[PDB]
């Protein structure tokens, strides 16, 4: 009567270490698909950091992304907080930034772009603006380390079943 | 998060580096490799916070808090046991004995080095009383036999040492005649004849014969039985064949 | 009771060996296609949406 | 900055207040009154106080001290009695000649003129350190040692300056860390908020068991260090006598006694019967004071207190089982906290839902039954702690369906029962075998196992014994006495003796200070044998009237057995247990033949 | 300075907020006759402000106000006993003043002379059954629970008259160790029901020794819950002064609690439950916490509050919220009064969690509180075996049935039957309760110890 | 980025209208700690919306906010198993990330796939009481009744890790042709009941097939009363997307009642009786809506909800409401708990109003459905005589009223008995509930065919 509840103890123990390698099996398995996620995002934001190093091919699609910005705040003015290197150019195409946003809306166009003093770095995003309200209301970040990580949520269904289909 | 993770690699690279200064316990230093290495380098905090926080080192609470667990057991085992010094093996074995255990918490050898310490440190703070000295030499004797035997095997003496110092430390300070009388019983149903020398003071083996002799020369009323009562308490050993003489004579 | 006293610790490497060849399959396909996704990434960063 | 937009009652609102958080506090008015902003609603702040404001005008200013409110963390807890506030009544009850809590005088939780001696640790210059490390270690009594002084938590940097061991105040420096520069200067009081709860490493299963005293309240359900258990009320029958002696019969190393809506004469009697007193730990010099920590709150103070009581008493057991002690939590009553809560919902005009409560008294009064608990230690040392929460709970409506019983009995995992007729027929305390539950049961049997007790096989028993003399004597009394078998005779029987022996407590038997589980586990085993011995006597051809004058005098040494100690002979087993082992063979043999 | 508006009993004014809370207001109508008030809250650009000469008399913009500057404050005085007041402070035959001499707040809270000690020495009421099962000490607050279609007022006055009466007798045996002084509080009572209580308390001879105050139905809501504030003020005054033990007595506190009901009823407050304020607790306790011995071991003040049960259950809010801060309580029963029992008082329902620590060796007897256990269950199973035996019969109970049956109606009819103006001693009424609980064997009796059963047995 | 106030559980902020109904936003405040939550309502320029992480701690002026765009969904995968994930779909394990591979809504029904064929093709979860006298099948929902004085949290583990092992002895009778899997829902409970859970169910080597949602008591609501509907899409998502049978609990209502109880605290909606919302028939529908056969059945979505009464009262609409809606209800006993059996479910007062429908041929036993009704009489016949047997003895009982009350005996201890780690079919539940019904005579047996009966006796 004691041997056998012995043998239903080892019995037991060895269906919870079964458990527990078939346990790390799935763990390393997920930590192999966390790592190559985890490396294929590190590899976007590298060519975003060199994508957004280059002001001259990066001012259409730094004035698409502040038209884009605009189009979603829809207030007339606004402090747009960029670069050292982003506010010049900026600076330059306010008015092709406003032509080209009421263009693509049915509203009239900004009145004066608000340039503010806080210059970011290449420490802290990718590159981009950050537009907000001149109300204090909201805050809109269109980085591309914010735009790539919240466009991550929704474009990583496409990669893990183009990638682990 | 990264600061507990950074502050426990720390403390566990101070600790692993306090319980080997000679380096002659590769098999100890050898599973914390991993975290001695970033702590045996000249590093920035925020260089070990940002590593850690990329998934370049190790950053699990549980398998830290395990390890700094049973490195900690392992750490105040060895320094529990002082003045007395452990096998350089017995060390190693007691570590791979603890490894593989599932439960070090939840075990009985974590409670008894607990004690031995909480034994040990009300002990220290205590003033010297008799219950105090029985308590020391059976502290004593549990630290010289827990530190030859290790912990990872079992023992009727450190059981019962542990038990009696449990008993007496319980006991309050109006009670002399029951840690007396267990002092008296526990030693003399122990195998040995005195386990006092080489362990313990010469001044404290005088003390205990001159307690005991003390203790039964007040029931005495003959002036032969309190001459050879009196002169019984002038040994420096703690003998059974005191404690019977003075039991047969009383 | 002796098979339950060597099987602690021989979980892992048997649950690591057992996931060997599916890290190297994944890792060959993960790192074939990891320019069509970091190129769709970037282009899609790159444009506004 | 502020200014006194309306007051009524004990809590005041201030508007033009923009930029403060939902915990900073602030003065109100001119008199320096404490208080903190719980709520806020637009431009104007609803802050409630801790003192009955009766003098103060609208328009007053009202500036905040620019960081939350909490209690300070420090040598000196002990050996004292405070307010819900963490204010110290002692200096208040000389100085501002009042016991109670006073209106206009501020005084520290901590005094700066209390000196104790501060030693290090084996930290160094130059060595890492994190939120909850061991940092020092200062003797707050002559009893226990290990209240080791340990930094705040969501702090991290090295250690630049380090200081000697020696005697030193509270006020002065002894430790400096700085991350990123030169942060700040450390002392050895700390300060935490009261609302925010104390972090830890990781949580432990509760397995360490722990012993109140109770003989009933151990044996109908297994009680462990670690673990949540009510207390059922009924607006008095003998509860604080259960709480205090529950309190002083308990032997662990910390002490949390917290009253939230207590009238004020338990607790003074509560605190002026712990120095008479002594403890099971050969204690000296208010062994019962110097071991517990005194938080005193009466319901003719303010809500405020007694609402900040239950989170100051929280993070004082957090602070307890992060320094690497098992502390148990004594806090009665509970509906003391919800009727303050409705009272300061109905007070300020938030809209309730729950048949006159407030809406959001469940989830606080279920976030705090989730706080306490066994687990890890946190810091780098990983210590070992635990904290146990027994909250008592009261009347707030009626007898099962009150909102504080019914939002308390879903979080909780042990359930007590409680006799509201034998209540009333002075037999607490009482217990009812039909409503009870307990999770850590299961998990305290692995550990019984391998210390071999035996209490869940006679509590199991005696519940199935207990349980079937409810239905044996409703049947009897509801049928009429014409007719019954002895199987049900001799369970009313032993039934009579396990409800005389268990039932009867605070003020029935002689031996209550201490009670250890190898006396109530063997206590049961009489009762158990005797009861199976009468069946299988039964059973197997015997007269109930020579069964039962077969028994004799282990029917009264049974019953009779609770009055003597378990000193007797052995260190934890009486002889009255060895000798009815003998004897029962004996009574059985006689019995059946 | 102007009324902006009125709802209800209550006149809210426009002004700016220069006085404090609770400070008293001076309104001025066109009529020819001034009135006082206080504001009960403070507000933005408008106060509320309760008056107390009438209701009747606001106009729109024809009035004016002025600020008195200082809060509400009632002076106490050595001298104060011995005169007729109101709830207001104001005599009612243009007599004696206040004269006081003293500053006190309305509420208790800025002296709090509650001392760190619980109640020991115990005042005997001159009941046997209610000093006997539920006996309170000096300090405590546990009130006497009343309920509707009894003369609960005739009983309270017969025991506080019988308190007083026994209290010469109780001096000596170290049950008080002071004078008695004796504190008259009215609130929605008739004016037959306060001259009985007056003549009562003139028969004891409290008359030059105690304050009257007089509180009627027809006055404001905030003068019946002010006076007994005032009073309690005085009785703490006078106790913590003096060191003299003191006994007030609240009644009627369902009046001060459909006052506090009243007063939410004209102002935009969230209700609790069973159509109350949420805020009566507060309230409520701040009456309760002017009570316990004072400062320096010699002097108490004893609080006894009057409760009536207007639907005859414990689960309402006025009389659960009341009782749930009070320790203990005491139930009358109408069947007891309907039988011919005087006073009826239940011992079922009504139980002390404190009786022990008011008792004490040397001023009562050891097995008082161990005879209050079995005493208890035996009126339980009297009442169980009882009602057992007129819903099924008498072919249905027990041995138990019979004996518990007897010793609840020898126990109903004798140890609840005295007068109204003899003393009953501690020792006497458990001379006289032990006799009643012989009835049984010794083997049926498990809520007392043996070795002081078998002393006094 | 302008927080208005706070009010209870719900905070309300200053934002713009641009975001939409139940979008996720995160507040980023001053002391360092960033917080997520879901919109609860949008208006002009207004808004109170609930905080998953704390209710209070943030600035009025000096916190920022931020919107992420994106709807309140959780990733559905098939690699969800043998994780521990939170109430908000967040994983607790500090490991790798979901990886899901579609999009499905969480607080509404992303297709709402619900089949219209019949009940049947029942399996079995691990109790042989449950299982066999009221088993249900894919399609319908049979809900657990329990009270204040049992482990009901242990109840629903024990269920749930009971599960999954039934399978490979189910798969050769034909009862499971197809991958099983659990769903686990934990609401209200502690840690260590989630971690003996958990160290449970991955003792048993059932936590690769099951997955893990711990809620703690200490979080918003609307994570609580949001923590099934990820449960139920992943079911739906397994089950209809994988083809394989999932069973899904969720435990405990309770707690998810007094969630949506203690919400609505600023809102112009009221509760309804007894303090509860006039809305809990759609909340309980809205979890109901994504549980059950699916369209192009292959797989099956059971749901057996675990309610547990804090009082025990009728009066109330959790069981009612709950029990109203399913086809059937059991119940469980404090008498058979406290005896020592688990689990301590009675068999008289549950029933099944489905359960000829879940049996059938090919994956059910054939005797069940008369094996059932014949233990359900011997145990209301084995109540009936035990109730008897007290009031007419021992020596003068009957043979039926004895043999009833040893086959209620023996059967309270054999057939509802059952262990904690072990998993036990309907069949070996048939046969061991076949020795227990063979004491009984052959002509005291006609609930059941001859052949079957002379088969099995």
């Given at each position: ?165 | ?76 085992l060895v320094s529990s046991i002082s003045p007395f010094k452990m096998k350089l093996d ?161 | ?49 | ?76 807890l002990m050996e004292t009695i405070y307010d819900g506030i963490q204010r110290p009544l ?236 098992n502390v148990s939590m004594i806090a009665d009553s509970s509906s003391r906290w919800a ?255 | ?457």
């Amino acid at each position: 009567g004691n041997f056998k509840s012995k043998l239903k103890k080892a019995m037991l123990s060895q269906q919870i270490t079964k458990s527990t390698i078939a346990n790390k099996m799935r763990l390393k398995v997920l930590s192999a698909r966390e790592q190559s996620l985890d490396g294929i995002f590190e590899e976007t934001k590298e060519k975003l950091s060199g994508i957004a190093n280059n002001r001259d091919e990066y001012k259409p699609i730094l004035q698409s992304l502040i038209v884009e910005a605009l189009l979603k705040l829809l207030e007339p003015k606004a402090i747009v907080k960029a670069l050292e290197r982003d506010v010049d150019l900026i600076e330059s195409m306010k008015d092709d930034i406003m032509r080209e946003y009421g263009e693509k809306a049915q509203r009239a166009p900004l009145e004066e772009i608000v340039i503010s003093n806080d210059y970011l770095n290449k420490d802290l995003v990718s590159g981009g603006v950050v537009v907000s309200n001149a109300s204090d209301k909201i805050e809109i970040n269109n980085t591309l380390e914010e735009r790539l990580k919240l466009l991550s949520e929704e474009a990583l269904p496409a990669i893990r079943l183009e990638l682990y289909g | 998060y990264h600061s507990q993770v950074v502050g426990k690699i720390g403390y566990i690279a101070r600790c692993m580096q306090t319980i080997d200064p000679e380096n002659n316990l590769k098999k100890i230093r050898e599973d914390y490799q991993d975290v001695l290495i970033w702590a045996e380098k000249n590093y920035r905090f925020e260089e070990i916070l940002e590593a850690s926080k990329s998934g370049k080192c190790p950053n699990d609470l549980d398998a830290l808090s395990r390890r700094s667990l049973i490195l900690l057991e392992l750490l105040r085992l060895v320094s529990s046991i002082s003045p007395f010094k452990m096998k350089l093996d017995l060390i190693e074995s007691q570590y791979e004995k603890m490894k593989q255990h599932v439960n070090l918490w939840k075990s009985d050898y974590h409670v008894k080095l607990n004690q031995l310490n909480q034994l040990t440190d009300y002990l220290k703070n205590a003033a010297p009383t008799p219950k105090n000295n029985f308590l020391r030499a059976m502290t004593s004797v549990l630290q010289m036999q827990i530190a030859q035997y290790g912990i990872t095997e079992d023992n009727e003496g450190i059981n019962q040492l542990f038990k009696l110092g449990l008993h007496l430390l319980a006991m309050a300070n109006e009670k002399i005649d029951e840690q007396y009388h267990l002092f008296k019983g526990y030693v003399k149903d122990q195998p040995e004849e005195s386990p006092f020398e080489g362990i313990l003071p010469a001044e404290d083996q005088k003390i205990l014969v001159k307690t005991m002799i003390d203790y039964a020369m007040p029931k005495l009323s003959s002036k032969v039985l309190q001459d050879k009562l009196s002169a019984l308490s002038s040994s420096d050993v703690l003998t059974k064949t005191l404690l019977d003489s003075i039991d047969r004579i009383v | 009771e002796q098979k339950n006293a060597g099987g602690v610790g021989e979980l892992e490497k048997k649950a690591e060996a057992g996931v060997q060849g599916e890290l190297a399959e994944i890792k060959k396909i993960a790192e074939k296609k990891k320019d069509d996704v970091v190129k769709i990434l970037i282009e899609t960063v790159i444009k506004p949406s | 900055y502020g200014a006194i937009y309306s007051v009524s009652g004990p809590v005041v609102i201030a508007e033009n207040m923009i930029g403060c958080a939902m915990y900073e506090l602030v003065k109100v008015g001119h008199d320096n009154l404490v208080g903190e902003v719980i709520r806020i609603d637009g431009d104007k702040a609803t802050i409630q106080v801790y003192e009955e404001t009766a003098g103060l005008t609208v328009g007053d200013p009202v500036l905040r001290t620019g960081k939350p409110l909490s209690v300070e963390l420090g040598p000196g807890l002990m050996e004292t009695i405070y307010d819900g506030i963490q204010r110290p009544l002692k200096a208040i009850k000389e100085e501002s000649q009042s016991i109670y809590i006073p209106r206009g005088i501020d005084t520290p939780a901590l005094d700066r003129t209390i000196k104790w001696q501060f030693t290090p640790g084996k930290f160094q210059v130059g060595d890492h350190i994190s939120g909850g490390d061991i940092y020092g270690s200062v003797f707050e009594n002559s009893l226990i040692s290990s209240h080791k002084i340990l930094l705040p938590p969501r702090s991290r940097g090295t250690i630049t300056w380090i200081a000697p061991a020696g005697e030193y105040t509270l006020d002065e420096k002894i430790l400096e860390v700085e991350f990123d520069g030169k942060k700040s200067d450390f002392t050895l009081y700390h300060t935490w908020p009261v609302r925010v709860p104390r972090p830890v490493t990781e949580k432990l299963s509760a397995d360490y068991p722990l012993l109140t005293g109770q003989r009933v309240l151990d044996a109908l359900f297994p009680c462990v260090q670690g673990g949540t258990t009510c207390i059922p009320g009924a607006f008095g029958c003998g509860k604080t006598v259960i709480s205090q002696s529950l309190s002083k019969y308990s032997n662990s190393d910390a002490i949390i006694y917290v009253g939230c809506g207590e009238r004020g004469n338990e607790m003074a009697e509560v605190l002026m019967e712990f120095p008479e007193l002594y403890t099971e730990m050969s204690g000296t010099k208010e062994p019962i004071m110097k071991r517990t920590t005194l938080v005193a709150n009466t319901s003719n103070m303010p809500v405020a207190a007694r609402e900040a009581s239950i989170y100051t008493g929280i993070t004082l057991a957090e602070y307890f089982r992060d320094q690497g002690k098992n502390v148990s939590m004594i806090a009665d009553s509970s509906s003391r906290w919800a009727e303050a809560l409705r009272e300061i919902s109905g007070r300020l005009g938030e809209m309730p839902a729950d048949q006159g409560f407030p809406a959001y008294l469940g989830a606080k009064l279920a976030s705090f039954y989730e706080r306490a608990g066994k687990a890890v230690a946190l810091g780098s040392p990983d210590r070992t702690g635990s904290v146990s929460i027994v909250a008592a709970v009261s009347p707030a409506g009626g007898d099962f369906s009150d909102p504080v019983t019914t939002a308390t009995l879903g979080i909780t995992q042990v359930f007590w029962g409680l006799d509201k007729k034998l209540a009333q027929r002075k037999h607490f305390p009482s217990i009812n075998t039909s409503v009870s539950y307990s999770k850590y049961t299961n998990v305290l049997n692995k550990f019984y196992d391998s210390n071999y007790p035996e209490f869940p096989v006679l509590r199991d028993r005696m519940k199935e014994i207990l349980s079937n003399a409810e239905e044996l004597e409703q049947v009897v009394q509801l049928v009429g006495k014409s007719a019954l078998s002895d199987s049900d005779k001799i369970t009313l029987d032993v039934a009579t003796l396990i409800k005389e022996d268990f039932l009867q407590q605070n003020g029935y038997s002689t031996y209550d200070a201490f009670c250890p589980i190898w006396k109530t586990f063997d206590m049961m085993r009489a009762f158990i044998s005797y009861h199976d011995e009468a069946q299988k006597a039964v059973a197997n051809g015997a007269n109930w009237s020579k069964l039962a004058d077969s028994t004799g005098d282990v029917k009264h040494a049974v019953s009779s057995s609770k009055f003597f100690e378990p000193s007797r002979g052995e260190k934890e087993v009486h002889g009255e247990f060895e000798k009815l082992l003998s004897t029962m063979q004996e009574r059985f043999a006689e019995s059946t033949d | 300075n102007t009324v902006s508006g009125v709802n209800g009993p209550l006149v809210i004014l426009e002004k700016v907020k220069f006085p404090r809370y609770n400070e008293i207001v001076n309104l001025t109508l066109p009529d020819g006759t001034v009135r006082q008030g206080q504001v009960l809250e403070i507000r933005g650009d408008r106060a509320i402000v309760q008056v107390f000469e009438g209701t009747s008399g606001i106009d729109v913009k024809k009035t004016t106000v002025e600020f008195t500057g200082e809060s509400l404050r009632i002076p106490v005085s050595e001298d104060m006993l011995g005169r007729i007041f109101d709830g207001s402070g104001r005599p009612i035959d243009n007599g004696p003043k206040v004269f006081a001499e003293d500053y006190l707040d309305i509420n208790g809270s800025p002296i709090n002379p509650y001392a760190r000690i619980y109640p020991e020495e115990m005042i005997s009421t001159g009941v046997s059954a209610i000093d006997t099962m539920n006996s309170i000490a000096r300090g405590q607050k546990i009130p006497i629970f009343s309920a509707s279609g009894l003369p609960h007022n005739e009983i309270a006055a017969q025991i506080c008259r019988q308190a007083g009466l026994v209290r010469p007798t109780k001096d000596v045996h170290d049950g008080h160790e002071e004078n008695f002084s004796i504190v008259f509080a009215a609130m929605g009572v008739n004016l037959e029901t306060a001259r009985f209580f007056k003549q009562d308390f003139e028969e004891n001879g409290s008359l030059e020794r105690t304050s009257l105050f007089l509180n009627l139905a027809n006055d404001p809501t905030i003068e019946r819950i002010i006076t007994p504030r005032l009073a309690l003020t005085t009785a703490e005054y006078l106790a913590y002064q003096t060191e003299r033990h003191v006994l007030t007595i609240l009644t009627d506190m369902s009046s001060y609690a459909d006052a506090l009901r009243e007063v939410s009823a004209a102002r935009e407050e969230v209700p609790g439950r069973r159509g109350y304020p949420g805020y009566m607790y507060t309230d409520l306790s701040t009456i309760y916490e002017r009570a316990g011995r004072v400062e320096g071991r010699n002097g108490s003040i004893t609080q006894i509050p009057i409760l009536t049960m207007p639907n005859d259950d414990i689960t309402h809010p006025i009389p659960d919220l009341t009782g749930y801060i009070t320790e203990g309580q005491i139930f009358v029963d109408r069947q007891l009064h309907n039988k011919g029992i005087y006073p009826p008082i239940n011992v079922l329902p009504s139980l002390s969690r404190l009786m022990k620590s008011a008792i004490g060796e040397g001023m009562t007897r050891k097995d008082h509180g161990d005879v209050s256990n079995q005493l208890y269950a035996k009126y339980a199973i009297g009442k169980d075996a009882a009602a057992m035996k007129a819903v099924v019969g008498e072919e249905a109970l027990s041995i138990e049935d019979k004996l518990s049956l007897e010793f609840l109606e020898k126990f109903e009819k004798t140890f609840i039957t005295q007068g109204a103006y003899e003393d009953r001693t501690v020792f006497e009424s458990l001379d006289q309760a032990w006799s009643l609980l012989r009835i049984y064997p010794k083997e049926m009796l498990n809520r007392i110890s043996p070795k002081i059963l078998d002393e006094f047995y």
